Design a protein around this ligand. Structure first.
Ligand SMILES: O=C(O)c1c(-c2ccc[nH]c2=O)c2c3occc3c(F)cc2n1Cc1cc2c(=O)[nH]cnc2cc1F
Length: 563
């Protein structure tokens, strides 16, 4: 069937859309080539619509059925809890899209009678009605990139009341079931440090390793009605409250498998028969579907001793080499099996015999040295997108601060330490906002974090070595230096000067600011300060940062204020 059908009504914005990076002094201090930075808008939605619309011709076989049964046997161990309306409301981000039913996310979080009454009515409707398709809004996503232009991605999501019901029925399932089914292959259970540990250990555990990333083209569009019902058959293996079993059954047929598309003007836009990007099950469903197809495809291709790592549609496989010619033919057989399963490739996969040459979750393993000179592996990435977005977030107030998430997740990197930390600490200190909580996203869930708490967060996630790394790889230094020239970012000597200046100001303030000066900026001086374990680090409640993926799932993981 067709992934989408369209009526001809346009994908519309619900307000003016900004496409160009503003010419602003603060963003200009970071990046001078402002014309190279753009944001996607609804103006490119028709180009995306064409790419995402195609027929799917899925063929399943014995390997697929065998893997599915193995996955279901593990899912059979799960006991999932139904969330109360109150627990589900508390998981709603404060700036979540309002309902069309007279209330918003703040009303949901406050347990307002209008919000709660409506959510209850939606819940009762899921229990009673097993068929009526649930309306969804389709919007063009606004994302910032550097030129060389990508058309806007399309987001599809149901109303706020439905999103709260999805949490009640499925938040516990999507949080716990992926690891029960996929074990060590489930990517979202790992912090970046644990991910690099798993990749390096897996790589070195093979006699002669071969690894590859597999890029599925337009993964959400490749997801079939069969795949969604297969996904539900795994969820159905959980022990569930009867209303949760009905709600999962109803949500599967009325929302997850497909449904009508409405634009921001309320016009009938089309019909979806593939994965919606903006529902609670997107991450979990995508991961299960990708793991299932890839595990079966590995068997069809006769790949030896596979270890996979999956995060949604992002797949990396590390196996035992059978020889160069054999590996090349076995990868072609894997691709052919994936294509039959409706997971055709974007970039054709290529065997890799150097772990540092593999990109997974847009990241690569690199090496640096700590204060003792010992090798430390860490995850890095090309800094182009992070810097273009950091420039955008400097010029405009954005709901999610990608810069903060990048500092947290890429804390050991040369670029996050020298550029991101220096830039934002300089500006926030000047504005008396170092202690002001900001929203960022970790594995798709929203968190409200104070920049002053970064030292303990980094110590907990990455270890104290994140504050001592030096002698970065020549390849990594070259990539950073090249990006800076491309974007018109000041050279690293300028960043060192700016860091020495903000470090001095931070130290002069005492308190948490002085902890930031000491730990975050020790790289900037010769007269190193002693870095001991931060008392605040061990007390940090990181319960739930690295449990599961929630991208598009409308999840907020920071604490609710007691009413
Ligand atoms: O956004 C993520 O879920 C994320 C981060 C992250 C980075 C920065 C801020 N907050 C974050 O959670 C992250 C991450 O951060 C550092 C290492 C590392 C890593 F290995 C995997 C990581 N993921 C999964 C993830 C990231 C990307 C991606 O970035 N591009 C394309 N496809 C992707 C597919 C994915 F499944």
């Amino acid at each position: 069937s067709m992934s989408y059908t369209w009526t001809g009504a346009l994908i519309t914005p619900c307000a003016a859309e900004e496409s160009k990076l503003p010419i602003n002094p603060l963003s200009n201090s970071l990046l001078r080539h402002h014309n190279m930075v753009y944001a996607t808008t609804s103006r490119s939605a028709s180009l995306r619509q064409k790419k995402v619309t195609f027929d799917r011709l899925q063929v399943l076989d014995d390997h697929y059925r065998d893997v599915l049964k193995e996955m279901k046997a593990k899912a059979s161990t799960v006991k999932a809890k139904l969330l109360s309306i109150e627990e589900a409301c508390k998981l709603t981000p404060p700036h979540s899209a309002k309902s069309k039913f007279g209330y918003g996310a703040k009303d949901v979080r406050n347990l307002s009678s209008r919000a709660v009454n409506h959510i209850r009515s939606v819940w009762e409707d899921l229990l009673e009605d097993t068929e009526t398709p649930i309306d969804t809004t389709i919007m063009a996503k606004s994302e910032v990139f550097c030129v060389q232009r990508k058309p806007a991605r399309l987001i599809v999501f149901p109303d706020l009341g439905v999103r709260v019901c999805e949490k009640m029925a499925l938040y516990d399932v999507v949080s716990t079931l992926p690891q029960a089914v996929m074990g060590s292959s489930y990517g979202f259970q790992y912090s970046p440090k644990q991910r690099v540990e798993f990749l390096v250990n897996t790589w070195k555990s093979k006699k002669c390793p071969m690894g590859f990333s597999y890029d599925t083209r337009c993964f959400d569009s490749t997801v079939t009605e069969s795949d969604i019902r297969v996904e539900e058959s795994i969820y159905q293996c959980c022990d569930l409250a009867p209303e949760a079993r009905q709600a999962i059954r109803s949500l599967t047929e009325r929302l997850y498998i497909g449904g009508p598309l409405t634009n921001s003007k309320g016009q009938n836009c089309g019909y979806r028969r593939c994965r919606a990007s903006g529902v609670l099950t997107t991450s979990c469903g995508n991961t299960l579907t990708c793991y299932l197809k890839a595990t079966a495809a590995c068997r069809a291709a006769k790949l030896q001793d596979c270890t996979m790592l999956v995060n949604g549609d992002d797949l990396v496989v590390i196996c035992e080499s059978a020889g160069t010619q054999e590996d090349a033919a076995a990868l072609r057989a894997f691709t052919e099996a994936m294509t039959r399963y409706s997971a055709p490739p974007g970039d054709p996969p290529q065997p890799e015999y150097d772990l540092e040459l593999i990109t997974s979750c847009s990241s690569n393993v690199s090496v640096a040295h700590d204060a003792s000179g010992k090798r430390v592996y860490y995850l890095t990435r090309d800094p182009t997108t992070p810097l273009a977005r950091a420039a955008w977030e400097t010029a405009r107030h954005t709901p999610i601060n990608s810069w903060l998430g990048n500092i947290i997740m890429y804390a050991p990197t040369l670029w996050a330490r020298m550029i991101l930390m220096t830039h934002f600490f300089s500006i926030l200190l000047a504005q008396e906002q170092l202690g002001k909580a900001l929203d960022c996203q970790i594995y798709g869930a929203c968190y409200s974090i104070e920049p002053l708490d970064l030292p303990q967060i980094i110590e907990r996630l990455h270890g104290l070595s994140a504050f001592t790394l030096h002698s970065y790889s020549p390849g990594e230094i070259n990539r950073v230096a090249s990006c800076l020239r491309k974007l018109g970012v000041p050279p690293l000597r300028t960043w060192r000067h700016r860091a020495r200046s903000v470090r001095a100001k931070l130290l002069s303030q005492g308190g948490r600011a002085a902890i930031c000066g000491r730990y975050l900026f020790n790289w900037a001086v010769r007269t190193k300060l002693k870095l001991t374990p931060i008392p605040a680090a061990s007390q940090l409640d990181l319960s739930g940062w690295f449990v599961a993926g929630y991208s598009g799932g409308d999840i907020y993981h920071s604490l609710s204020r007691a009413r």
